[PDB]
Amino acid sequence: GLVPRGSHMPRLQRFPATASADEIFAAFQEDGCVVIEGFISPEQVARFSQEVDPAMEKIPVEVTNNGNSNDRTKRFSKCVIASPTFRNEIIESDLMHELCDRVFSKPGEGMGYHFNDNMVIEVQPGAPAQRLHRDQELYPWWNSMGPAGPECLINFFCAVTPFTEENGATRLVPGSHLWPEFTQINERDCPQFGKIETVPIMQPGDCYLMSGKVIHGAGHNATTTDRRRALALSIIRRELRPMQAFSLSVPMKLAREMSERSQTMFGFRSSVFWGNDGKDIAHHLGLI
Amino acid sequence: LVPGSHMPPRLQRFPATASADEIFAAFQEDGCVVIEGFISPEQVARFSQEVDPAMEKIPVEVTNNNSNDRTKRFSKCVIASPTFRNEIIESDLMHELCDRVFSKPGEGMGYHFNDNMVIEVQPGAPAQRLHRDQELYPWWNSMGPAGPECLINFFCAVTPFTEENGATRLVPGSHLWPEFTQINERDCPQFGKIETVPAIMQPGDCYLMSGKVIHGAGHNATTTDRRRALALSIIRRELRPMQAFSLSVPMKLAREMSERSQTMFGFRSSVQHCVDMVHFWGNDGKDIAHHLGLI
Ligand SMILES: C=C1[C@@]2(C)C[C@H]3[C@]4(C)C=CC(=O)OC(C)(C)[C@H]4CC[C@]3(C)[C@]1(C(=O)OC)C(=O)[C@@](C)(O)C2=O
Ligand SMILES: C=C1[C@@]2(C)C[C@H]3[C@]4(C)C=CC(=O)OC(C)(C)[C@H]4CC[C@]3(C)[C@]1(C(=O)OC)C(=O)[C@@](C)(O)C2=O
Ligand SMILES: O=C(O)CCC(=O)C(=O)O
Ligand SMILES: O=C(O)CCC(=O)C(=O)O
Ligand SMILES: [Fe+3]
Ligand SMILES: [Fe+3]
């Protein structure tokens, strides 16, 4: 009795941040995405939002009407440089790694994943809805492999300020990771274009774990006041190249304080790729 | 020529002064092609001499195996060889061809370095399993021959490549087979029935080879010949390199590279387009070359 008996049915499962990893993962497989409510302790999600606000204030807003994803949407990636909670607390969630290890790692080969980006995405008010897309369009041949292709990218998309249907929370399309052809989503290339059934709604600290095969896009921010802010944990196979060059921007001072696993996530350490003439790059960097 | 003898596959050969279009047409037809004189014999000889110390301090690994042993493999060529970083990586024919393979309209450089490896096959070294280089990116075979290119290799003879000292065994036209499998008895139906052909080359020659081409280092049946190679391994901008070059190459060497050589090693970004644009391997909307001070 979830929709009125007889209704058309719109599946967007939700789990507590305290459930098992296999539980959350099974929802990921079946739907392509899933919500983790309280993925981040609320003091953290709050101390974090404060910590990056000054960097966010020095980001001018584009009012372009050119269809961009930069039109009235603020984007900021130096989260580890500018936020102690982020680099010390958020990136060390064992749920994150336990799930990454289930999407990506092969047995006896160590961590099969690393970071692509740490973006804070703040959808400004009056911002047009973002073009629909699969995140794996970042790796342009991936769509060519269809839903039998391996996973390349997952996104722990975390709500900073509340995600309403009015302030433009992300429009998901669960199950589009099993459609038989992966196209771009436009009138010329997508046959279902205009008939794609979206499904929007989260509180500060929640997140959703979306596959890279899943169609989505930020909605229109219809409000006058609400700067709707997010923090996306983009994580990729170790064979793929990060969009952010973190091991050259993030200073060595911060890297020495990270875990072995987090140095691996930012490329300050190698995995069984990105080495140094037959040896781990961590030797040459001063990290034993 | 040979006497109704069985005729092997054609490995096409071009001098480094042929047009990049003529060389690329062969690469596209066969998946591989020799470029005679890719490096000058003077340039290669000084490279071989500039790396030789680090090469002698490399111990030969001998094992009780089918292990890919008794092969020295050295990757710090930029740090050890002025000739390599000043001249070899500035081959305009190398970049012409990379562009024709990897670069998209309006995006700039579609490619960068995966590795710069001196590969010295020792006397008696066993032959290498037949493989495609794109098995490094394990999902690539599943796209088959219609797949895009992920990797090409400019595989240079530093010392002569003979059939007896272990010149690479190549399979022209294996990039057009309808199914790409690992070359094992379990998965490959042509296992044991695959005809290869050596890359007979003189020093400074190279062959350009697709990641789709089946190949393997040959057996070095000589007693004296240490068969040296320089592998310039080039991948598309979205793939991760084997070597963390931007972290082990010193900035002093970085600041002295052309801007395309900085891009090759990750000291500089390239622009990818999706209506959207982004600097791949970049710094919060800016080319990484800013934060590093490279203008
Ligand atoms: C250029 C863009 C790309 C190509 C990549 C994309 C990226 C890395 C994609 C997937 C991902 O896993 O993680 C995040 C959430 C960090 C996003 C961040 C935003 C950008 C950098 C991007 C952009 O800023 O465009 C002006 C876009 O908004 C978008 C969706 O159009 C893209 O596909
Ligand atoms: C581990 C190996 C990998 C996975 C990669 C491969 C690599 C990067 C492949 C492609 C390439 O373009 O560059 C070069 C030519 C430099 C080679 C160098 C040698 C190694 C590092 C490798 C190895 O050392 O095996 C003992 C191999 O020989 C082989 C065939 O098993 C592989 O496919
Ligand atoms: O901000 C959002 O709601 C989604 C943005 C997104 O998916 C992207 O930038 O790739
Ligand atoms: O040494 C050779 O000739 C072949 C090397 C090779 O194919 C590899 O290491 O991948
Ligand atoms: Fe997205
Ligand atoms: Fe090879």
Author numbering:
A (entry chain B): -3 to 6, 8 to 197, 199 to 270, 280 to 295
B (entry chain A): -2 to 0, 2 to 63, 65 to 273, 275 to 295
Paper text:
AusE (Mr 35,100 protein, 314 amino acids) and PrhA (Mr 35,121 protein, 314 amino acids) are very similar (~78% amino acid sequence identity) αKG oxygenases that both accept preaustinoid A1 (5) as a substrate to form divergent products through dynamic skeletal rearrangement. Non-heme iron and α-ketoglutarate (αKG; also called 2-oxoglutarate)-dependent dioxygenases are widely distributed in nature, and play a major role in diversifying the molecular scaffold. This superfamily of enzymes employs αKG as a co-substrate and Fe(II) as a cofactor to couple substrate oxidation to concomitant decarboxylation of αKG to form succinate and CO2. AusE first desaturates at C1–C2 to form preaustinoid A2 (6), followed by rearrangement leading to the formation of the spiro-lactone in preaustinoid A3 (7). In contrast, PrhA first desaturates at C5–C6 to form berkeleyone B, followed by rearrangement of the A/B-ring to form the cycloheptadiene moiety in berkeleydione.
To understand the structural basis for the expanded catalytic functions of the PrhA mutants, we also solved the X-ray crystal structures of PrhA-V150L/A232S mutant in complex with Fe(II), αKG, and its substrate (3, 5, 6, or 7) at 2.25–2.3 Å resolution, as well as PrhA-V150L/A232S/M241V mutant in complex with Fe(II), αKG, and 3 at 2.35 Å resolution. On the other hand, AusE and PrhA-V150L/A232S mutant first abstracts C-2 hydrogen atom to desaturate the A-ring to form 6. Next, AusE and PrhA-V150L/A232S mutant catalyzes oxidation of 6 to form the spirocyclic 7 through radical rearrangement of the A/B-ring. Here the C-5 atom of 6 (5.2 Å) is closer to the Fe(II) center compared to the C-9 atom (6.0 Å), which supports the mechanism involving initial abstraction of H-5 by the Fe(IV)-oxo species. Subsequently, the spirocycle formation can proceed through two possible paths. Path A involves radical rebound to form the hydroxylated intermediate, which leads to deprotonation at C-9 and migration of C-1 to eliminate water to form 7. Path B involves homoallyl–homoallyl radical rearrangement through the cyclopropylcarbinyl radical intermediate. The lack of potential catalytic base near H-9 and the stereoelectronic problem regarding the syn-arrangement of the migrating bond and the leaving group suggest that Path B involving homoallyl–homoallyl radical rearrangement to be more plausible.
